[PDB]
Design a protein around this ligand. Structure first.
Ligand code: LQJ
Ligand code: LQJ
Lengths: 268, 269
């Protein structure tokens, strides 16, 4: 499993499944008209979870019937697999879901259809998902997770590939950004009407040395202090939390991020 | 300009317009069923351009009727304007279209509706737009363009804001990347079901200094190389600088990119 593909999950499966006669009528029954595009904290979202198993089994049938094209995730993923001739025994897939039932719905179906096709997969959820003042914290968190993963698998000697096709815009923007930073092998994308997948350009991108110099000596100073003696050799730590490089959590607010610490170590 | 907003334009307007009874039937008449989602080099795309004025006038009516919500671009843009209370007088808005008739159709309608609302706007077209082996060159080109605007207005002392909402995924990803690099004030995004726009987090990001130091030394020798002096200070031009930093390279000569030349100047040299 030395070929890992990371992807977001969206609601493509939901929206494409309203083509199926059986699905449109069963969904229309539960009153789930626009179930692919609803507010993250919508009443219709609870409808999806109490019927979750009912809907999960319906979409498996639609996904087996339609194949690749039923969903953005599977369409782009399997286009890329055949393009790059990846073996299923040497293959691993990471699906990130959001904290919404339509996203976990699509995630669960895609995970099942992959393991049925003979492809190992793993689900995951950025729990920090709603709009009001949490959405920015959510993409912050998903960025922190993906970038750590990419370094971890890259240390083992995995070939990491990034499916930037599916999920919300910011979700996909950060998945390519983290890939560029953590040195992923490829970032691919496939538009609905493309024949096969296309590879995005990769600029050589790093954390700005202005902040990076203070991160070097952050670890050396026992990391976390007060105000003056925390800025004791020139560490603006509130500035560091604003640029999402350090975490506060409590009173003092001195917690070097787990990816940041690991990325400094790759000056060898 | 005193608060500049750059955006991509997609086929949101086209897709949302098939709600209108007049639009659905007139579009269905021209056989433009899925006109929001067609291959960039599709026959249906020519259908759009010979009826362009007919369709341009139809969508103006729909856009005046619906307002903001008729398109992603206008919905996210005007949500941001009211959020950040930009006085209409000082606004300038930069819409990039792709090289497809549906996109320029959307663009033209949006340009007209903005100038009618009292907002200065300007169209643009990334001409290198098709799938086969041109799409990566096209987003390379859009990235080259949108980098420049950010540097220009930021040097003048005007603020700059990026609408990462609209257009294809790569188009929006590189619009935010450029913003992050060239030091734009904000990058905002609005999901179709959000109340108003949300501001994306900002890691402090630049081009890695290991490549940056090789790019400074390329500049000093007037660009366009092949061999012998191809690794004179440690510059692999068809290998490491084939990561989109050098143009052509494998055919004719190996020249450096017009954005990277201007970016070495903007980072103090
Ligand atoms: N008036 C407007 N008309 C049309 N679009 C508008 C308008 N105002 C704003 N927009 C937004 O503008 C972007 C242009 O398309 C859209 O944001 P985008 O990131 O593209 O979201 C679209 C899809 O939402 C899906 N997905 C919705 N929930 C979730 C969710 N909770 N987890 C993951 N994916 C989700 C994503 O997965 P997928 O493969 O099907 O594509 C995306 C629109 O939501
Ligand atoms: N089996 C599949 N089912 C569903 N979606 C699939 C599938 N395989 C791939 N996808 C893609 O995955 C994303 C959603 O799952 C989509 O790609 P995305 O880049 O998000 O397309 C989004 C919209 O394309 C539109 N726009 C189509 N033309 C053009 C064009 N020529 N200039 C600009 N924008 C264009 C834009 O309108 P806007 O404001 O609402 O947002 C974009 C789909 O094309």
């Amino acid at each position: 499993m030395n070929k890992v593909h990371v992807s977001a999950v969206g609601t493509s499966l939901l929206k494409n499944s309203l083509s199926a006669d059986n699905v449109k009528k069963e969904v229309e029954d539960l009153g789930l008209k626009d179930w692919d595009r609803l507010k993250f904290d919508d009443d219709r979202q609870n409808k999806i979870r109490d019927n979750f198993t009912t809907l999960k089994d319906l979409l498996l049938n639609f996904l087996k019937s339609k194949g690749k094209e039923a969903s953005a995730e599977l369409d782009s993923l399997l286009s890329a697999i055949e393009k790059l001739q990846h073996k299923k025994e040497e293959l691993y897939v990471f699906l990130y879901t959001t904290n919404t039932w339509n996203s976990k719905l699509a995630g669960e179906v895609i995970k099942n259809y992959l393991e049925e096709e003979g492809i190992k997969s793993e689900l995951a959820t950025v729990k920090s998902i709603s709009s009001e003042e949490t959405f920015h914290e959510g993409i912050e968190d998903l960025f922190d997770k993906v970038i750590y993963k990419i370094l971890k698998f890259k240390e083992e000697g995995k070939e990491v590939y990034i499916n930037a096709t599916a999920g919300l815009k910011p979700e996909t923007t950060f998945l390519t950004l983290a890939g560029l930073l953590a040195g992923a092998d490829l970032v691919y994308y496939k538009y609905q009407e493309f024949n096969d997948v296309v590879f995005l350009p990769s600029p050589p991108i790093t954390i700005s040395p202005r902040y990076l110099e203070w991160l070097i000596e952050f670890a050396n100073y026992g990391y976390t202090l007060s105000e003056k003696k925390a800025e004791e050799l020139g560490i603006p730590v509130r500035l560091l939390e604003v640029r999402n490089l350090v975490e506060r959590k409590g009173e003092d607010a001195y917690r070097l991020k787990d990816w940041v610490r690991k990325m400094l170590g790759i000056y060898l």
